[PDB]
Structure 1
Amino acid sequence: QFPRQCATVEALRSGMCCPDLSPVSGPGTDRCGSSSGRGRCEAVTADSRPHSPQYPHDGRDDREVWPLRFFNRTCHCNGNFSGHNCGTCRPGWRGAACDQRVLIVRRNLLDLSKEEKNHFVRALDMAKRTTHPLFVIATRRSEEILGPDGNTPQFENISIYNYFVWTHYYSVKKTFLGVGQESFGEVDFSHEGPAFLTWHRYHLLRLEKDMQEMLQEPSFSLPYWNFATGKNVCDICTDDLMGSRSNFDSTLISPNSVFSQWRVVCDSLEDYDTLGTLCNSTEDGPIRRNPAGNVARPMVQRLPEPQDVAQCLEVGLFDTPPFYSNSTNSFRNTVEGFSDPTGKYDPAVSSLHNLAHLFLNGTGGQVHLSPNDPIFVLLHTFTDAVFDEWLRRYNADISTFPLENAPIGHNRQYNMVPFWPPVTNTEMFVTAPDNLGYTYEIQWPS
């Protein structure tokens, strides 16, 4: 979403989000750090290819051709510099000149020392309560973004972790068609299409980086949850990790865990989809969670089996037509969970990543809310670990990731909504250890 210095009347009217870095001659003198060698303001590269006919409302939705409905000028950073104003480094690099390589290791949450488990839980809690130093979130769509008097940008500060929740919400929300009109819901810029794995990869990378700067710990890494154990239970739902079941309410988190104190954002869909507003930073109810608790649906009362992971890593084409939730023999769709681990599509199956979500029977099972439950982080670093092993094994074969006719948001060169600066799926479609400064300490079934 947008840097606070671009969430201004001047910046939105200009269409330029190219903030200063260290201006020593007055405002606008070091845009993108162009005084040093760090970058320059330039025109936005956005995808103009066609999308699937599934979305019929071209011209109605601020997320189309991201980010041109807000800005047509951005920073492009030189070399291994990065960031909204080219003041930081690309993933895997540090130092004033972005020339010292780092490689952080993402580990199984269960393998961490007692002090590392407690350090991770507290870091997450700190992110829930700490204002994001860079990004603010829109509470209204572009037509109303400048406020009633036209001079009051409709943005709020938001914590580090709630920003992580908000961008996921924004990527899946419905297209508002107007008061009286029913919002359009056959659209999802981060699921049910090829961009699912690259989108969620950046999502994790952005939270990880934000927590490193919040902690001043360059090497801090996000753990993962191996949910492919075939278990009846959630083995990370203990009070030293993520929280156990409350004994006073089967659907709440134990009061002995800090997560029972969390209050969710973005749980007012009926307001957003009838008044055309957006999720803001005001929190509401508690996390609801009830592992295996969906008696109405026995298929989602057990977690994937270890053999589900091995099977899906044998699917060698990243994605297949129609590049949607009903694709067959698509690794993307298999690991996402709409096909079975062998690639066979079945409207009645949920497996792997989808199954782990549904197994929570709660806040984590609803796509517009699920990052509110911090299991989401661990569930998706695991999905990313699977994705990374695929990248290794099939040599990052981006060839079946379609350039056009995907569901909207999912063309290969689409800028992943709503990340800032603009970042394509392509930039994420690389093996992490050589290209993104992280790797997984994990071994696969065989």
Structure 2
Amino acid sequence: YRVRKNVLHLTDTEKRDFVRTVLILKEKGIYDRYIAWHGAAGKFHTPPGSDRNAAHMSSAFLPWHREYLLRFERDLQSINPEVTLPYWEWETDAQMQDPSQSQIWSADFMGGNGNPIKDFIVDTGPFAAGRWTTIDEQGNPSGGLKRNFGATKEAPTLPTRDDVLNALKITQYDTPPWDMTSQNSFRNQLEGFINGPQLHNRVHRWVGGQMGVVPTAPNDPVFFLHHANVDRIWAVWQIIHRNQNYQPMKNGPFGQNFRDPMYPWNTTPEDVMNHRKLGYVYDIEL
């Protein structure tokens, strides 16, 4: 099936085609759908007055994003059928002396860190301001992609391989009360609220700029590379604990159970439980 590859193993040509396909999606008005859907789920609380939302801080975090990526990728392939979504393996970059030296940040791919004299506006790469129009929380143009690697003092480093390995050991998908306080929960740990920010959250913070905030995060195309890695880690977790399943199955908040629709779609967690049936694998499976 479709193979999702480590960013570091992409050809320069596979690289160029992905960037180019993302630019075509932006130009068409399609990319903005993804920014919007994500901000909208972020405001949709399950139940209202609570601190879970459709896409974060609860059991749906993982399948929600798997669905998001699947949809994103099909759109990619409507433009170019040879393109799949790659993943950013940040736990290896965390190894590098200077993470900000990773080739993912090359001018030919995601482009670079922000310019501190311009308020951390990004001015190298295909998504530099003037080449890529971002949208503020309201749905209007915002003036340009920003990034500020490792500057947030609580998230100065990327997650390590050991962080990923320790998460892979948790036997449970998730526990009550199915939120950011869930303990011994693979979901809450991979998401990063288990004494973090760690893993998923930590990467967001580390990148800074739009990636640092929920409502604006997907303005940075690297959002999708980050999330493919989270999805990958979940896929590996499911392979290991083959007899473990999504929790909760029932009785949890509406929108959070195995067969509830995940706003803003009708897709349920159960629809996306098996990634191979969605048509794709990660190169490591292989």
Q: TM-score, normalised by structure 1?
A: 0.59
Which residue is equivalent to 2:9?
111
Q: Distance in 2 between matches of 1:252 and 1:381?
A: 25
Higher strand share: 1
Offset from partner CA, 1:244-284 (integer Å, 9 cap, x none)? 1355536121244334322222423xxxxxxxxxx4xx422
Quote how far apart the aligned CAs of 1:115 are: 1.1
Aligned match of 1:379: 226
What is the identity percentage for the equivalent residue pairs of Structure 1 and Structure 2?
31
Whether 1:438 aligns to 2:273 is no
Give distance in 1, aligned partners of 2:124 and 2:12: 20
Do 1:239 and 1:256's aligned partners in 2 also have CA atoms closer than 8 Å? yes
1:367 corresponds, among 202, 214, 237, to 214
Matched AA of 1:233: P
Residue of structure 2 equivalent to 1:292: 150
Q: CA deviation at 1:301?
A: 0.9
* Superposed displacement of residue 210, structure 1: 0.9
- Residue in structure 2 matched with residue 239 of structure 1 by the alignment: 107
Give the structure with the higher percent helix: 2
TM-score, normalising length: structure 2: 0.90
Rg: which structure is higher? 1
Q: Describe the shift of the 1:396–1:264 C-alpha distance in structure 2 as closer, same or farther (beyond 3 A).
A: farther
Shift of 1:289: 0.8
- Could you report, residue by residue, the CA deviation over 1:342-367 in whole angstroms, capped at 9, with x for unpaired residues? xxxx3xx2111110001012100101
Which residue matches 1:128? Answer: 26
Cα distance in 1 for residues equivalent to 2:53 and 2:178: 13
Match of 1:354 among 187, 201, 204: 201
Structure 1 position 185, deviation (Å):
7.0
- In 1: Cα distance, 2:264 partner to 2:108 partner: 33
For residue 368 of structure 1, report the CA deviation from its aligned partner.
1.0
- Consecutive unaligned residues of structure 1, counting only runs of 5 or more, are 1-102, 131-158, 176-182, 269-278, 340-345
Correspondence for 1:403: 250
* Paired letter, 2:43: K
> Which structure would you say has the larger RCO, counting Cα contacts within 8 Å and 6 or more residues apart?
2
Count, aligned residues = 277
Structure 2: distance between partners of 1:237 and 1:252: 14
Give 3-state SS (helix, strand or coil) of 1:300's partner: coil
Gaps of 5+ in 2: none
Q: Which residue of 1 aligns with 2:240?
A: 393
Change (3 A) 1:250 1:285: closer
- Taking only aligned residues, the RMSD between alpha carbons, in angstroms, comes to 2.1
- What CA distance in whole angstroms lies between the structure 1 residues aligned with 2:136 and 2:114? 23
Does the 8 Å CA contact 2:59/2:248 hold for their aligned counterparts? yes
Amino acid at match of 2:121: L
Aligned equivalents of 1:414 and 1:165: distance in 2?
A: 23
Asked whether the 8 Å contact 1:404–1:412 carries over to 2, the reply is: no
How far residue 187 of structure 1 moved from its aligned partner, in angstroms, is 4.2
Contact 1:195 1:409 (C-alpha < 8 Å) held by counterparts: yes
Letter in 1 for 2:73: E
> Partners of 1:424 and 1:402 in 2: how far apart?
11
* SS of residue paired to 1:169: helix
Local SS of the residue matching 1:105:
strand
- The corresponding residue for 2:192 is 337
The 8 Å contact of residues 242 and 259 in structure 1, kept in 2 or not, is answered as no
Match of 1:423 in 2: 267
Who is 2:172 aligned against? 317
Runs of 4+ off more than 6 Å: none
Question: What is the letter of the counterpart of residue 287 of structure 1?
Answer: L
Distance 1:173 1:199 in 2: 14
Does the 8 Å CA contact 2:114/2:146 hold for their aligned counterparts? no
Q: CA deviation at 1:285?
A: 2.5
1:253 corresponds, among 83, 101, 122, to 122
Taking the aligned partners of 2:279 and 2:44, their CA distance within structure 1 comes to 35
User: How far apart are the structure 2 equivalents of 1:371 and 1:399?
Assistant: 26
- More displaced stretch, 364-373 vs 233-242: 233-242
The question of whether the paired residues in 2 share the 8 Å contact of 1:223 and 1:381 is answered with: yes
Looking at structure 1, the residues matched to 259 and 125 of structure 2 have their Cα atoms a distance apart, in angstroms, of 46
Contact 2:52–2:179 under 8 Å retained in 1: no
For the 8 Å contact 2:114–2:147, the answer to whether it is kept is: no
CA distance in 1, matches of 2:203, 2:170: 20
CA deviation digits over 1:190-224, x for unaligned, max 9? 11111100000000000100111122x1x421001
